[PDB]
């Protein structure tokens, strides 16, 4: 009746020993996990990362926020104090009652209420932004002169800070710019203030630490599910599927989780709190709402098992005309630029996304040449914008090779769309190719080598 929330999703206990390898641990629990999209890590006890700000010196501005379900929302001035006296003062209004005497089943019952609710229009404040001097880390970070207990924290893997930089991470090596993805985030909440369904850029993880403050309440999807949910999403708010000129014009929204499981789409929910993390696996579903003022912080990042989920992704963003952030193919190549320092196991699981990249390569070669595009030239597509490189027609961002043609100097196709560049005949054409396949067979031996 009215809300049935979802079943729990996993909990994980780790002992000191697990925990020390966050890689090895999330390898671990993926066979679980996985089935859930999303799940909760509890650190050992004495785990405890000191956090430690100015509540008047942090600033930000926040976003304002409607809480109207299916309604579409972009995915995208206050003290850390002010905030908070807003926030504590919202809820215990809201309720008429002291803030730590309201029931996290009862806000979840009223949020579900009052986004369904027409003649409700409770509006909401949050802060989200990567980390800056104007507003850094709740982790310690290597700068001021810092306490033994901050310096036992500096180097931790789940520190989300050194998470993207550690020899099991992928993004690690990515040159390109992608700081709105490599970076961590902080997120101020206050009750009610929500995220809305969504996937990660390029189907990658995320972990998101609560530093403090009270919960945070997910809904999450396992990966297997992704398009049973768009097709139920799109069936009920088709305005959100339609084609977006970037990135940063994504439509997303709040959706009650009983209605995704009505239409048969598995959903599990958690309560984060203060010192827990929850991780989203590859291409999970995740919303969710804060129960009160709190202050939290996540990163993406990328395994070595995400390696093939990620070459699928960037087909998927081609089918659905989605820019991407940066080049799976040039992250590839850079990585195999690089074997003889590559951790083994990720030389070994690079050296099979680079084989399959290379036999695709070869074979899309060979039909535009089919095709009449004689003439060729070698191009450091590394060097050129992303929006120098972008396909005319399905928007990928190219690297291992494209067409021009000199009647539209400057215009780009991938080489599924040479029939979509311009109207002159192909051999007016010329493939721009940043290695031949002899150049592409010694690297993925490096690779070979190193990982023996
Ligand atoms: O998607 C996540 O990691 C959760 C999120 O944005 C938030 O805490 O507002
Ligand atoms: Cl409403
Ligand atoms: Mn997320
Ligand atoms: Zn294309």
């Given at each position: 009746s009215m809300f049935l929330p979802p079943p729990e999703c996993p909990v994980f206990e780790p002992s000191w020993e697990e925990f020390a390898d966050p890689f090895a641990f999330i390898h671990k629990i993926r066979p679980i996990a996985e089935q859930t999209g999303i799940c909760k890590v509890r650190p050992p006890p004495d785990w405890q990362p000191p956090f430690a700000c100015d509540v008047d010196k942090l600033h930000f501005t926040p976003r304002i926020q409607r809480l109207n379900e299916l309604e579409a929302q972009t995915r995208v001035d206050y003290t850390l104090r002010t905030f908070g006296e807003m926030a504590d003062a919202f809820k215990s209004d809201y309720f008429?009652?002291?803030?730590?005497?309201?029931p996290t089943e009862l806000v979840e019952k009223e949020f579900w209420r009052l986004v369904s609710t027409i003649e409700e229009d409770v509006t909401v404040e949050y802060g989200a932004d990567i980390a800056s001097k104007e507003f850094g880390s709740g982790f310690p970070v290597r700068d001021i002169k810092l306490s033994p207990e901050e310096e036992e924290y500096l180097?931790?893997?789940?520190?989300l800070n050194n998470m993207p930089v550690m020899?099991?991470?992928?993004?690690?090596?990515?040159?390109?710019?992608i700081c709105g993805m490599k970076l961590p985030w902080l997120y101020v909440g206050m009750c009610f203030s929500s995220f809305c369904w969504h996937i990660e850029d390029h189907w990658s993880y995320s972990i998101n630490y609560l530093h403090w403050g009270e919960p945070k309440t997910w809904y999450g999807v396992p990966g297997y599910a992704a398009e049973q949910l768009e097709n139920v999403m799109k069936k009920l708010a088709?305005?959100?599927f339609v084609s977006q000129?970037?990135?940063?014009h994504q439509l997303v929204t709040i959706m009650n989780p009983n209605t995704l499981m009505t239409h048969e789409v598995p959903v599990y929910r958690t309560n984060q709190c203060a010192g827990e993390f929850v991780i989203t696996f590859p291409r999970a579903y995740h919303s969710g709402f804060n129960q009160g003022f709190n202050f939290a912080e996540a990163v993406n990042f990328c395994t070595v098992d995400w390696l093939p989920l990620g070459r699928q992704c960037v087909e998927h963003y081609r089918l659905l005309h989605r820019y991407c952030v940066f080049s799976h193919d040039e992250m590839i190549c850079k990585m195999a630029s690089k074997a003889?320092?590559?951790?083994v196991v990720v030389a070994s699981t690079v050296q099979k996304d680079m084989a399959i990249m290379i036999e695709d390569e070869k074979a899309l070669r060979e039909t535009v040449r089919k095709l009449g595009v004689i003439d060729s030239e070698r191009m450091?597509?590394?060097?050129?914008?992303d929006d120098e490189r972008?396909?005319?027609?399905?928007k990928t961002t190219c690297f291992m090779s494209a067409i021009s043609c000199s009647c539209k100097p400057g215009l780009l196709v991938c080489l599924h769309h040479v029939?979509?560049?311009?109207?002159?005949?192909?051999?007016?054409?010329k493939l721009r190719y940043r290695y031949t396949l002899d150049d592409l067979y010694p690297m993925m031996n490096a690779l070979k080598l190193r990982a023996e």
């Open positions: 008429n009652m002291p803030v730590h005497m309201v180097d931790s893997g789940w520190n020899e099991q991470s992928v993004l690690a090596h990515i040159t390109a710019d088709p305005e959100l000129p970037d990135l940063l003889d320092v590559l951790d450091d597509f590394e060097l050129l914008p972008q396909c005319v027609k399905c029939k979509e560049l311009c109207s002159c005949p192909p051999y007016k054409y």
